[PDB]
Amino acid sequence: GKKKKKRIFTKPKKPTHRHKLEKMRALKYRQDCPHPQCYCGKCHLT
RNA sequence: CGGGUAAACGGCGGGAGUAACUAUGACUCUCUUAAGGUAGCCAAAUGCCUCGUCUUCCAAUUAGAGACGCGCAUGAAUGGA
RNA sequence: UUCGCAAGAGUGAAACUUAAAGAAAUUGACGGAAUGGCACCACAAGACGUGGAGCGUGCGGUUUAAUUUGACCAACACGGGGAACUUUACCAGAUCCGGACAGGAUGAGAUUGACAGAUUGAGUGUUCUUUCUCGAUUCCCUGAAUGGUGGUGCAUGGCCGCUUAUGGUCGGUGGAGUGAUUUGUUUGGUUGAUUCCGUCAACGGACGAGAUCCAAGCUGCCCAGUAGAAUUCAGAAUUGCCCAUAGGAUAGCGCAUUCGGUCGAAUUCUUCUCUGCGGGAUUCCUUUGUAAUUGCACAAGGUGAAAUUUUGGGCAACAGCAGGUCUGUGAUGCUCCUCAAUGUUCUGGGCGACACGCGCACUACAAUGUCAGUGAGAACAAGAAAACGAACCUACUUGAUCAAAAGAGUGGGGAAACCCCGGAAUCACAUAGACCCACUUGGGACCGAGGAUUGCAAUUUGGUCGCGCAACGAGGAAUGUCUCGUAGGCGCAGCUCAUCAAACUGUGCCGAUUACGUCCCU
RNA sequence: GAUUGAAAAUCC
RNA sequence: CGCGGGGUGGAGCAGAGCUCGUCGGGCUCAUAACCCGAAGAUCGUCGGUUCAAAUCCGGCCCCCGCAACCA
RNA sequence: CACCAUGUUCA
Ligand SMILES: [K+]
Ligand SMILES: [K+]
Ligand SMILES: [K+]
Ligand SMILES: [K+]
Ligand SMILES: [Mg+2]
Ligand SMILES: [Mg+2]
Ligand SMILES: [Mg+2]
Ligand SMILES: [Mg+2]
Ligand SMILES: [Mg+2]
Numbered sequence: 001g002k003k004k005k006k007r008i009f010t011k012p013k014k015p016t017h018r019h020k021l022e023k024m025r026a027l028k029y030r031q032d033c034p035h036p037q038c039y040c041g042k043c044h045l046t
Numbered sequence: 047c048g049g050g051u052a053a054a055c056g057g058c059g060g061g062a063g064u065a066a067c068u069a070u071g072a073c074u075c076u077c078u079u080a081a082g083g084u085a086g087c088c089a090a091a092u093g094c095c096u097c098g099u100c101u102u103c104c105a106a107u108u109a110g111a112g113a114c115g116c117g118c119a120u121g122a123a124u125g126g127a
Numbered sequence: 128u129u130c131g132c133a134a135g136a137g138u139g140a141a142a143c144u145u146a147a148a149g150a151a152a153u154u155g156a157c158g159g160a161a162u163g164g165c166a167c168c169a170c171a172a173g174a175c176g177u178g179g180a181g182c183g184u185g186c187g188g189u190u191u192a193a194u195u196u197g198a199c200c201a202a203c204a205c206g207g208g209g210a211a212c213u214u215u216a217c218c219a220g221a222u223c224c225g226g227a228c229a230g231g232a233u234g235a236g237a238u239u240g241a242c243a244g245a246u247u248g249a250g251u252g253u254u255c256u257u258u259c260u261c262g263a264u265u266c267c268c269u270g271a272a273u274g275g276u277g278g279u280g281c282a283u284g285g286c287c288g289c290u291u292a293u294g295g296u297c298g299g300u301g302g303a304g305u306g307a308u309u310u311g312u313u314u315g316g317u318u319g320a321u322u323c324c325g326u327c328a329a330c331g332g333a334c335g336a337g338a339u340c341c342a343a344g345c346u347g348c349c350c351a352g353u354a355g356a357a358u359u360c361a362g363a364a365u366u367g368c369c370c371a372u373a374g375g376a377u378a379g380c381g382c383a384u385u386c387g388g389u390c391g392a393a394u395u396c397u398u399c400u401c402u403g404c405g406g407g408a409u410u411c412c413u414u415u416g417u418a419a420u421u422g423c424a425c426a427a428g429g430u431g432a433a434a435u436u437u438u439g440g441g442c443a444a445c446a447g448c449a450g451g452u453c454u455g456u457g458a459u460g461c462u463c464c465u466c467a468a469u470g471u472u473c474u475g476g477g478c479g480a481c482a483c484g485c486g487c488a489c490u491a492c493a494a495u496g497u498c499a500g501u502g503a504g505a506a507c508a509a510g511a512a513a514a515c516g517a518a519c520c521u522a523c524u525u526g527a528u529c530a531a532a533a534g535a536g537u538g539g540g541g542a543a544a545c546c547c548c549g550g551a552a553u554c555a556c557a558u559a560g561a562c563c564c565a566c567u568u569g570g571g572a573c574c575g576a577g578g579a580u581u582g583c584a585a586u587u588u589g590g591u592c593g594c595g596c597a598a599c600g601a602g603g604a605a606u607g608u609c610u611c612g613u614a615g616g617c618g619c620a621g622c623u624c625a626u627c628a629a630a631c632u633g634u635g636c637c638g639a640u641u642a643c644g645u646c647c648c649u
Numbered sequence: 650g651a652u653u654g655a656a657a658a659u660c661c
Numbered sequence: 662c663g664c665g666g667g668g669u670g671g672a673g674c675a676g677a678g679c680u681c682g683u684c685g686g687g688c689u690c691a692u693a694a695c696c697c698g699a700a701g702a703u704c705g706u707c708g709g710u711u712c713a714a715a716u717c718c719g720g721c722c723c724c725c726g727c728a729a730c731c732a
Numbered sequence: 733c734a735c736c737a738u739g740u741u742c743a
């Protein structure tokens with residue numbers, strides 16, 4: 001069958017991405033997205 | 047020239063491989079003869095090697111006996127046992 | 128120990144070994160036993176092969192990172208298995224969770240996604256730097272869950288193959304047995320047939336066989352504006368004396384033939400065609416046949432479109448098989464993996480790599496041929512699209528003031544309407560055509576240069592010019608299939624399918640030899 | 650290792 | 662010591678030949694038997710001589726022998 | 733009346 005013979009890795013284990021927490025980011029802030037529906041995170045507009 | 051006859055005189059093979067450990071080899075090839083030694087028997091008054099090897103006999107055995115047998119070169123009225 | 132010349136005879140243990148050894152019946156199975164049948168998956172008589180060559184494909188080895196795997200008569204163009212990606216199950220990587228749900232640790236920052244720069248094979252937030260954006264959807268770890276073309280077809284379902292193409296199979300009640308078991312289900316004839324007839328310790332049944340069924344013939348009703356015909360009125364074309372190159376043969380002797388564009392009108396009809404139900408064949412009829420000496424039948428001939436299961440199919444009892452399939456499935460039991468996954472996606476490679484062996488194909492070895500013309504001619508079929516047409520198939524034109532392969536345009540067809548009057552290839556030709564017995568204008572293996580086209584991808588597939596000096600001149604031992612519209616030859620369609628049939632499932636075309644037997648072989 | 654239903658054998 | 666003899670496909674053997682073996686394909690459910698095919702020895706060795714050498718002739722190197730005597 | 737041998741162990 002598909003034996004789990006395991007695998008040797010030539011690279012380090014890439015970490016799981018974690019969202020950066022900006023406590024009270026609203027207090028810190030600023031340009032409003034010009035895009036009608038919307039760097040602008042919503043439209044990725046640079 | 048063609049037959050017969052060995053209780054006529056006499057004669058009576060070699061090499062190579064092979065079993066689920068290893069040996070050795072039932073087995074198989076191959077060369078060969080007139081026939082390739084049968085039954086027996088043996089280091090025998092017959093064996094070179096040889097004071098063969100094992101057992102037995104002695105404190106000690108190139109001796110004796112019983113085995114064994116690749117028998118220089120045992121063997122059937124050249125009579126064998 | 129006794130006896131014997133001997134050979135031996137008489138007497139006669141044990142140690143140790145071992146779960147059976149035997150005996151008679153029954154049912155199978157087997158026989159280089161007998162008997163009667165039967166089958167070109169057997170043979171006889173044949174016919175076309177195969178095995179020899181090139182090439183396609185499958186299988187095995189060899190190799191490889193991986194060259195995924197099943198299967199070994201009844202595996203080997205089989206898995207509908209013609210794999211560019213996908214498929215794909217294999218290999219080198221890289222994503223996602225598609226871990227529901229419950230309990231924790233969080234938390235209106237739980238979270239989600241990201242531009243750029245580099246990470247990388249990746250103008251892959253994949254992860255990072257970096258800030259944005261999303262918002263209770265999700266994270267975290269604990270059990271759990273889930274998926275798997277993971278395993279095991281020797282755990283199974285279902286299906287298929289095979290036994291097993293033949294005539295087989297099983298109760299009941301009665302009879303016979305101590306019983307397993309037997310009789311019915313017997314033998315004789317008959318038959319493809321456990322098909323009938325006769326017989327009968329059986330008598331009644333049930334299933335297979337046959338019947339039914341679906342196509343091919345022949346025919347009745349129906350039927351046509353998705354099928355045809357024949358007339359009649361026009362419109363037209365040829366029109367007579369006509370003798371090839373050398374020009375044979377082969378009907379014609381009120382009213383000469385032609386013209387699916389002449390897109391002609393009119394009228395009538397169903398010869399062909401369409402097709403739902405009908406019919407038709409039953410050994411029916413006939414032998415101073417065979418048989419019978421009741422029968423059941425049979426052989427010839429007749430009649431007929433068809434004359435014996437009319438023909439080709441389908442269906443097919445009862446037992447089996449550790450046959451195949453856990454790679455068809457939300458068929459599954461038990462197991463294995465499960466978040467750097469045996470899940471899932473994406474990228475690159477493999478499934479097609481070669482010295483070889485084998486199965487099955489396709490093309491050859493030329494003259495009953497090969498080129499190059501002309502002619503006449505089938506059938507089976509398939510066609511376009513979700514949450515107004517467009518994809519699909521076509522004809523015709525053009526490209527064309529100039530190869531093919533293309534590429535355009537314009538129409539038509541949802542398919543008895545278009546394709547289509549379906550110009551299939553075998554085939555024909557008195558074509559006064561080329562070649563002339565050679566591996567050659569036979570044969571195309573294999574390779575070079577250009578260009579097209581399918582496709583996301585061609586490092587696919589046509590077409591053109593080279594190459595041919597690749598074998599191969601008919602194939603040893605062997606060995607397949609086949610009896611009439613058959614073998615063989617020849618095309619065509621469907622299918623898989625973006626592209627690609629030496630495959631298969633159908634279909635028409637042209638059309639033989641032989642046998643009409645037999646148990647030698649199997 | 651393959652093989653097998655397990656072994657043996659064989660190859661590997 | 663002398664005196665001889667003989668050295669060849671993997672094997673046993675001729676003078677490359679034969680037999681067996683080997684390898685490929687049949688035949689078999691398979692194996693053997695069998696059938697059809699393929700390969701495998703410049704011949705102890707070396708040198709000379711010969712057109713040319715397994716051969717001829719030497720020299721070696723083995724094997725096998727046969728003799729190896731006579732108060 | 734030519735020849736015509738054999739099938740590892742359990743299951
Ligand atoms: K006595
Ligand atoms: K006695
Ligand atoms: K024989
Ligand atoms: K034996
Ligand atoms: Mg003797
Ligand atoms: Mg002696
Ligand atoms: Mg003494
Ligand atoms: Mg003595
Ligand atoms: Mg002696």
Ligand SMILES: [Mg+2]
Pocket residue numbers: none
């Ligand atoms: Mg003597």
Ligand SMILES: [Mg+2]
Pocket residue numbers: none
């Ligand atoms: Mg299996």
Ligand SMILES: [Mg+2]
Pocket residue numbers: none
């Ligand atoms: Mg099985």
Ligand SMILES: [Mg+2]
Pocket residue numbers: 204630
């Ligand atoms: Mg196929």
